[PDB]
Design a protein around this ligand. Sequence first.
Ligand SMILES: [Ca+2]
Length: 448
Amino acid sequence: SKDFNNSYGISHITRDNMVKIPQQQNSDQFKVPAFDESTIKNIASAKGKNASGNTIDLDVWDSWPLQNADGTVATYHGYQIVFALAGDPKDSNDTSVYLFYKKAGDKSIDSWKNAGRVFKDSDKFVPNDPHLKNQTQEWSGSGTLTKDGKVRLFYTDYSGKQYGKQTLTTAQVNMSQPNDNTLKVDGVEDYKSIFDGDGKIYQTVQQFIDEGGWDTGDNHTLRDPHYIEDNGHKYLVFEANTGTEDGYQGEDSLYNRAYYGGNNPFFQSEKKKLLEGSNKEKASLANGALGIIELNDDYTLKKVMKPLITSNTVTDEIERANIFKKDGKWYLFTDSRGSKMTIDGIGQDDVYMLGYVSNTLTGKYKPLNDTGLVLHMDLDPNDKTFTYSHFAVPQTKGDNVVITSYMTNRGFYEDNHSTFAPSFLVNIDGSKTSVVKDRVLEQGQLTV
Ligand SMILES: [Ca+2]
């Protein structure tokens, strides 16, 4: 037959793991806490310009804190820093990275000030770079406070004039303080593309173009770079899709036992069902990956490494890659949409954070809570307290991590702009996780 088994020396989000998320997810152990509608506030300082040029209240989406190397929230001249994607739906597509800041001691969302856009429109054209001048949008990433005490940003260069090309990009963000309660973005330097895919380990946009682009239903990704360090080495962990040599998309992927897990009877039943049902083509195209590249000390590409984990057959889209070390173990997280999944019992309303644990950085990642489920959110997108882009922020002590997310906040009354969601706690103990009951933090709170 066509049945085979190739793990490609890497870990896999398996169908056997995923089919067990239904019912399990109904436990309060995994459910995102209900939020109080009466106290939801817009980020007051979140004001800027649209594509038309006038000043508007912004919709704030994907956000990430400035971090130390280990992932804990950094302190910069007494401030905590948050980078967030923001824009105006009258531009719809247009999104840029903004720098928000607040004295670490303060707690209120009203304390978050706005330093404005990290980049000027003109910034992408300064450096001699293979990709930057083709940029149309700024997408997610990470931020690190270097040993030299510099603000080092990683983000995604999205190119709408190159078939949705995504390039992992870096820049040093030069800061100043005009007064003793203001942070100012002076400008940027060392602004450069790092990686746009190789083809064999991670899919390139050229492979996306050559297959027929948007029409195919394929979803090309190469984004959300997350910075970490291990043993003196610098890495980025990011959302991608596999390449030709590490379990590519296509019909034959449906015959690989490694993507299914479980026993042979499960492999046969699940595969038969997948081959005959409505999700055959969707599953064939699904080859999402959490990738890892090693960097040089100047943040240029050093080595393209094999993926930490892939989601062949399950989904093309495992987003907001996150990784940190806790209790000597490596915890790897991703957010995923049920709508993009090919799993029975998981549907359009379902939104997840999935999690995995390994003894080493590049070792075998085993599912948290046996299935990989950490968080489940299933509110209608039009509900005021819909949350998205859940992100685990490690803490300096304790078994708890702080989950940040954005709340789309599409209510009828004010306040109704996309904003920081109330933060909450997830307990991490070995391979077990649990939402901490009755502990909701302030909107956008990074630490306890
Ligand atoms: Ca794909």
